[PDB]
Design a protein around this ligand. Structure first.
Ligand SMILES: [Zn+2]
Ligand SMILES: [Zn+2]
Lengths: 46, 37, 65
């Protein structure tokens, strides 16, 4: 139910905000992606 | 061997892939045995 | 980089023939030139289509998240 971020390696949903640094629970690997949009995108099929 | 000495953190063993993303420099330590006399 | 659904030049689907083709190869041990022919790929347009594809995706998959 709802997510905000993700880890490059240990692909695990996070969810944060200012103050709590930008790392992850377990492995540091301080990267993190930003998981898709909720409002699905549509495509021409040509 | 290559490593990231970031503050508010220890010292991660840096791998290219990360330096690329994080804009870091895949470099390492230069140590020399000085003599005090 | 996945098998081309349908051949650029003429139109014949070719989306399926991949696995078949890759099979009449390592198993039934035939030579490409023929395997294709077996798969119904007459004219060279559809023919070069399969014979040249580099299925990179297989490497792409070997990655991770
Ligand atoms: Zn993590
Ligand atoms: Zn063709």
């Amino acid at each position: 139910a709802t997510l905000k971020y993700i880890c490059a390696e240990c692909s695990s949903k996070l969810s944060l905000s200012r103050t709590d640094a930008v790392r992850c629970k377990d492995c540091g690997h301080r990267i993190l992606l930003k998981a898709r949009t909720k409002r699905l995108v549509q495509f021409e099929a040509r | 061997k290559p490593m990231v000495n970031e503050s508010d953190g220890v010292t991660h063993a840096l791998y290219p892939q990360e330096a690329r993303l994080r804009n870091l420099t895949y470099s390492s330590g230069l140590f020399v045995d000085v003599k005090k006399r | 980089m996945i098998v081309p659904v349908r051949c650029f030049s003429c139109g014949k689907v070719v989306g399926d023939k991949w696995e078949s083709y890759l099979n009449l190869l390592q198993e039934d041990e035939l030579d490409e030139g023929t395997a294709l022919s077996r798969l119904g790929l007459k004219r060279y347009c559809c023919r070069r289509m399969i014979l040249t594809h580099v299925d990179l995706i297989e490497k792409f998959l070997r990655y991770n998240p």
